[PDB]
Each structure stands twice: as C-alpha cells, then as structure tokens.
Design a protein around this nucleic acid. Structure first.
Ligand SMILES: Nc1nc2c(ncn2[C@@H]2O[C@H](COP(=O)(O)OP(=O)(O)NP(=O)(O)O)[C@@H](O)[C@H]2O)c(=O)[nH]1
Ligand SMILES: [K+]
Ligand SMILES: [Mg+2]
Ligand SMILES: [Mg+2]
Ligand SMILES: [Mg+2]
Ligand SMILES: [Mg+2]
Length: 325
RNA sequence: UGAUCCAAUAACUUGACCAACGGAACAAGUUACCCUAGGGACGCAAUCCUAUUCUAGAGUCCAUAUCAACAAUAGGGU
C-alpha cells in the first residue's frame, strides 16, 4: 500500500554562441537510483513536492565552448522498485542497490540548427511500486481466518501483513497475509485489484477457505466452500491468467465445527468431481480453467490442529519447486 | 580657409592636404647592455532560460497524483 507518483522534467540545454558558433551544454538528465535503508514514504516526506528537475546546461562562453552538461538529478528509491509510466507501462525494475535508470532526458544545447537556443528537455510522470512479494501469499475471504492462521503459525504476531514460518534448520519461509482480498473485487477493481497486483509477485499461493461456507448478508447468496473456491478461481482468471501457473495449496479452516467433518467430506467429493456441479454456476462464474491443488488440508486455528503438517507440506512443495527449477 | 621669411614678375599679382592646420626649410626604428635628472602606484530594449509566488483550464479519487495558460517579481546569456 505505497504506490507512488512523481513528476520529472529534464533541464533545458545551454544557450549557444552565435558569432563564434559555440554549442551550449546539454540539459541535466533525470535518473532514479536504488539505495537501501529508505522507503517510499521516507522519500515522500523528505520531498513533499514530488517534483524533480535536473541542472541546466551551461551556456557557450568564449573561454570555453561546447559547454559542460548540467548537473543531473538522482532520485533515491528502495530496492525491489518497479518504475512505470503514467500509462502503467513498466519503465524498469530496480532489484539491487546502485541500479540506475534514466527516466527523463535533458534538452539539447544551443546548436546552429536550433538558432543557438537551448532546446527544452523532457516532461514525464513516473509511478513507483515498492512491492516485491514474499514466497507464500495467503488468499482468503473476509473472516476466513487468514489473520488467525497467521497468528497461530507465527510464534507471536498481531492478527489485526507479513510474517515468517520458522523451521528447525533455522530456515524462514516468508508468508504474506493479505487483508481485503474481497473488497467488492468483482465490482471494485480500483482497490481490491492492488491486492492482486501485490500477490502476483508470489511463488506459491495458499487459499484459506472456511468449512462453514460464507455469506455477506442474510439477503446475499449463501456460497459454500466449493463455491468460494470457484469464485476465487474465476477472480484469478479474470485478473491474470498467468497467476494460476503458480502452485496453489488449499486449507479448509474452522475444523472445530460439529459439521466440519461432513462438510469437508462433501467438499472433497466436489473436488473429486467438479464437472458434475459446474453447471450450477452461470457462464460468467465458470472459470476458463480449473486450478489443481497439490495438497488440501483441514486445519483449525483455535485448537492448533494440522499447522505443523501444513508448514511441512509448504516446505516440501517449495523444495520440490526448487529442485524442478 | 594658412601668418613671416623666401621664390617668380617691369608692374599688378601669384605660390603651403605648412591637414601636427599660430605653421622648425629639410631627420626613422630598437635597447632585456642601457645611462641621468625627477614624479607616482551602466543601461535600455528585444528575445531564450530559471529561483520564488498567484491558476484560466485539464484530468485526480480507491491509505495513491497533480500539472499548470496569462502574469508577478528576482537573476543568467544572445
Ligand atoms: N471456532 C473457530 N473460530 C475461528 C477459527 N479461525 C478463526 N476463528 C475466529 O474467527 C475470527 C477470524 O477473524 P479474523 O482474524 O479477522 O480473520 P480474517 O480472515 O483475517 N478476517 P479479514 O480477511 O477481514 O481480515 C476470529 O473471531 C477468530 O477467533 C477456527 O478454526 N475455529
Ligand atoms: K605643431
Ligand atoms: Mg484479518
Ligand atoms: Mg596648435
Ligand atoms: Mg584660434
Ligand atoms: Mg637575453
């Protein structure tokens, strides 16, 4: 939640010298550099104006000619930055410190072709995305116990985010519990789609589905757990087809319910034969393809049931992916 | 528009980029090889750009933006 935007303008060139024929210095260029220890919010509250202008090329003197280029401006940003344009096209990616990208060029100097005038520079507007998502991304409906699952899986974490799963080998698996996955995603692509843009940069997806189904209101449709999974798959297909290529695991929560066993059995039957029930949904709700789950585990966030096995399965799946790649 | 002297002429008259123009009849460079007598240590305009301000207009919504015509003064060049 830190999407940024700046206005950049390269300085104009240098005024040439007509009688002799001297060129003026080229205008300063606009560059963005990757540095650590600072964040996008840090940049914003350092420079509230959000505008960067480089130097201006020196005019053509008579002691010297072909003037020196103006002092370029360097814009510091953190690592893992995606720089795009106002149209959203990705200008570049800065993944390591000292990565430098030119965004706006300075104006040319005062050549005779331009009547020795210092041609103006470039005006551009750039966007910043400080989002390099973790390896595991949690996807779940509201109240589907994503925060509770994160709190249970972490030694100590606030369940209202990013957390780490610790192993005996002192290995940490970086997980991201993303709230508001369904903030009218089918209707508000303005806010519930930044969630999908953040989650798209994750290697593994963990869907968390409540066993007791879900319902927004008494006047809203009661969708079962299988219906919730189908809705998740349809939303993923609508958002980005390439996201489904990543490995996905399923976790049916709230096993402490009295009917949880029968509900999970029914859900497993539906998973085994989904084609027999896909007609019940409209053609809009029918996904282009069905997501295959490497593992589906029943878990309970209250009784701390199956969490160790889920962590072991996640580690094994990550190891298998690494070995394959 | 040019004095004296001087020159020509029987006479009346005449002669000066003497222009350094109150005009010496006619005389140049270089000296670190030097010498002597002395004295001292800005505005006016057109144009092009930018530092700071206002905003006619354009879009801006989503823990996610603003740019900015015309001006206003402060300065740099042609
Ligand atoms: N009985 C029972 N209650 C559970 C279980 N898991 C979660 N809960 C309860 O259900 C609620 C979950 O709320 P919350 O932590 O906000 O989950 P969430 O999915 O992150 N909600 P949101 O997506 O809106 O942020 C809590 O009251 C929690 O105690 C479970 O396995 N069993
Ligand atoms: K004289
Ligand atoms: Mg939560
Ligand atoms: Mg005199
Ligand atoms: Mg007199
Ligand atoms: Mg000598």
């Amino acid at each position: 939640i830190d999407k940024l935007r700046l206005f950049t303008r390269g300085g104009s060139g240098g005024m040439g010298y007509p009688r002799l024929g001297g060129e003026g210095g080229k205008g300063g260029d606009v560059w963005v550099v990757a540095q650590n220890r600072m964040t996008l919010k840090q940049l914003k509250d350092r420079y509230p104006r959000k505008r960067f202008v480089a130097g201006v090329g020196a005019n053509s003197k008579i002691s010297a000619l072909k003037g020196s280029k103006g002092k370029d401006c360097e814009i510091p940003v953190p690592v893992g930055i995606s720089v795009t344009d106002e149209n959203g096209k990705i200008i570049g990616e800065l993944n390591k410190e000292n990565d430098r990208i030119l965004v706006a060029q300075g104006g040319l100097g005062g050549k005779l072709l331009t009547n020795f005038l210092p041609l103006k520079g470039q005006k551009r507007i750039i966007h910043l995305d400080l989002k390099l998502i973790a390896d595991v991304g949690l996807v779940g409906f509201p109240n589907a116990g994503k925060s509770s699952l994160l709190s249970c899986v972490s030694h100590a974490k606030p369940a209202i985010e990013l957390g780490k799963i610790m192993y005996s080998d002192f290995k940490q698996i970086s997980v991201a519990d993303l709230p508001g996955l369904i903030e009218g995603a089918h209707m508000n692509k303005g806010m519930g789609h930044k969630f999908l843009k953040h989650i798209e940069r994750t290697r593994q997806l963990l869907f968390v589905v409540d066993i007791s189904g879900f319902q927004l209101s008494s006047h809203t449709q009661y969708r079962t757990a299988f219906e919730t999974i189908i809705l998740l798959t349809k939303e993923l297909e609508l958002y980005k087809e390439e996201l489904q290529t990543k490995p996905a695991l399923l976790a049916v929560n709230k096993m402490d319910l009295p009917d949880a066993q029968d509900k999970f059995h029914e859900l497993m039957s539906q998973l085994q034969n989904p084609k027999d029930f896909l007609h019940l949904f409209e053609k809009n709700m029918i996904p282009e393809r069905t997501v295959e789950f490497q593992h589906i585990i029943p878990i309970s966030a209250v009784t701390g049931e199956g969490i160790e096995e889920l962590k072991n399965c996640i580690r094994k799946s990550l190891d298998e992916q690494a070995n394959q790649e």
